[PDB]
Specification:
Elements lengths: L4 E5 L17 H7 L4 E4 L11 E4 L2 E8 L2 E6 L13 H7 L2 H5 L21 E4 L2 E5 L7 H5 L9 H7 L1 H5 L8 E7 L3 E6 L12 E6 L3 H10 L4 E5 L4 H6 L3 E7 L2 E7 L10 H8 L3 H8 L30 H10 L7 E5 L7 H15 L3 E5 L13 E7 L6 H4 L8 H4 L7 H10 L6 H17 L2 E5 L2 E7 L2 E2 L15 E2 L1
Parallel strand pairs: 1-10, 1-11, 14-15, 14-16
Antiparallel strand pairs: 2-3, 4-5, 5-7, 6-7, 8-9, 9-10, 11-18, 12-18, 13-16, 13-17, 19-20
Family: Belongs to the bacterial solute-binding protein 5 family.
Subcellular location: Periplasm
GO molecular function, one term: peptide transmembrane transporter activity
């Protein structure tokens, strides 16, 4: 009989429905209940959990048929946890206007269109064949289907409950099936021994909420948990001291930044935005708070972007001489500028802010913290500077320079960034182009416009730390999720 796995977690997601559950805490549970048509093989070819190789999963085979359509041949006889057979009807429903991207659908799945390409209606050609397609050119359909957008839901069962009720009683095809949810306390899953893939190695997996990281460290020391989540490099020394325990860390595909409400007169133009960007000494922050474990990216550029990653890109400029020149050029009069942060919701948010307040003071700018309480929502008119984070969810450069800072999106529409026409033309174009010299050059150029305009200032790629018993073999992956397929063995 297999061991029961117990994971001490920072929290539980608001839903277990694949899109509504998208969060720092959802994917780790959702990845076990559901399968996608394509799976990202993080450990392929000896990689330490960071490979972007996409391999077929519920799709037995696929063939791209033109610049915007892919014919998928599905695995036959695969069952959902309730006994329903997985067919083209279910895959077409998953990426349909009715469930995901239509006007009525986004009323219950609010990010269904935001995390999707320009989908056209799926076409069911036979019981196990479906064409997934876009209205305009798209060579990213494969990447979107291998992302957190991809999980396949059962048509009849999902339709009879709806997105919110499905999220509290989810049915998928994955290696573990939903047993129970006690809101903000635990989610228990039980082994799906009818799983089309490899036999699950745990009898059950419990995701138990433990708000305090110190209480989680004690839970691992005592024997309440096998694996614990959401630690920082400072907690590594206490855990490693125990010979039967060890820390397991990795860089995650997320980016910490600060952004500006550009409707405010002081941030309507790029001048003072650039001054605050050039005054930030990023290695001094990563040395003092992240134990040099965080990585400072060279532009809005990451190795998981694949063919749109530029390793020869120069790092982001730190120049206090230029920063002081821009402060005076902007007409900045010395009024304190607020920096909103909901405490340390993002790791090291307040200590990073306090370090930057000194670096901005050196440049001639007074920035004060506006530490808002959990449960509060500051009104947009009261925001000058605010911290933010963007999960780089696709294995492509589109997420999040285009998906967040592009045309019609919130940074330009809600926060007022007047982006140059070239940025919006290249954003619309790179969504359509296939990987080549033209696509890679357009991203390198978009990155340059991003730095000149400074609608956000990138700080660093965070370092996520897990801790686990040495008798549980599991390696983390470079994304905010947990993968147990070919990566969960008990000693």
């Amino acid at each position: 009989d297999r061991r029961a796995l117990r994971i001490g977690v920072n929290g539980l997601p608001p839903s277990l429905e694949p899109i509504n559950g998208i969060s720092n805490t959802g994917p780790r549970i959702i990845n076990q209940i559901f399968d996608a048509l394509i799976r990202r093989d993080y450990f392929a070819d000896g990689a330490k959990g960071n490979n972007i190789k996409l391999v077929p999963a519920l799709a037995e085979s696929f063939e791209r048929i033109d610049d915007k359509s892919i014919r998928f041949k599905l695995r036959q006889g695969v069952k959902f946890h309730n006994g329903a057979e997985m067919t083209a009807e279910d895959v077409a429903f998953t990426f349909s206007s009715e469930r995901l991207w239509g006007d009525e659908a986004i009323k219950t799945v609010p990010n269904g269109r935001n995390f999707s390409p320009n989908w056209d209606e799926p076409v069911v050609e036979d019981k196990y064949t479906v064409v997934l397609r876009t209205k305009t050119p798209s060579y990213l359909i494969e990447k979107y289907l291998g992302s957190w957008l991809g999980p396949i839901v059962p048509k009849e069962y999902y339709k009879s409950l709806g997105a919110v009720a499905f999220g509290n009683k989810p049915i998928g095809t994955g290696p573990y099936k939903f047993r129970e949810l006690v809101a903000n306390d635990h989610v228990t899953l039980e082994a799906n021994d009818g799983y089309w893939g490899d036999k699950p190695t745990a009898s059950t997996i419990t995701y138990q909420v433990v708000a305090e990281p110190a209480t989680r460290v004690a839970g691992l020391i005592s024997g309440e948990y096998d694996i614990i989540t959401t630690l920082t490099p400072d907690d590594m020394a206490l855990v490693d001291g125990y010979s039967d325990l060890e820390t397991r860390g990795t860089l995650i595909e997320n980016l910490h930044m600060f952004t500006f409400n550009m409707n405010q007169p002081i941030f309507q133009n790029k001048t003072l935005r650039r001054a605050l960007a050039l005054a930030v000494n990023r290695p001094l922050i990563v040395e003092a708070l992240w134990k040099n474990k965080a990585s400072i990216p060279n532009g809005f550029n990451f190795p998981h972007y694949g063919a749109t990653y530029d390793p020869k890109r120069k790092p982001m400029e730190f120049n206090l001489k230029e920063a002081k020149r821009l402060v005076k050029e902007s007409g900045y009069d010395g009024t304190p500028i607020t920096y909103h942060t909901m405490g340390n919701y993002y790791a090291n948010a307040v200590p990073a802010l306090m370090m930057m307040i000194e670096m901005w003071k050196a440049a001639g700018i007074t920035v004060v913290p506006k530490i808002f309480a959990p449960g509060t929502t500051p009104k947009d008119s009261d925001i000058l500077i605010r911290n933010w984070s963007n999960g780089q969810w696709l294995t492509d450069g589109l997420t999040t320079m285009v998906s967040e800072f592009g045309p019609g999106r919130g940074v330009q529409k809600r926060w007022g960034w007047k982006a140059p026409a070239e940025f919006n033309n290249l954003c619309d174009q790179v969504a359509q182009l296939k990987d080549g010299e033209e696509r890679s050059a357009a991203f390198n150029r978009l990155r340059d416009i991003f730095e000149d305009e400074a609608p956000a200032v990138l700080m660093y790629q965070p370092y996520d730390v897990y801790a686990a018993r040495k008798d549980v073999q599991w390696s983390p992956v470079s994304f905010e999720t947990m993968e147990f397929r070919g990566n969960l063995n008990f000693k």
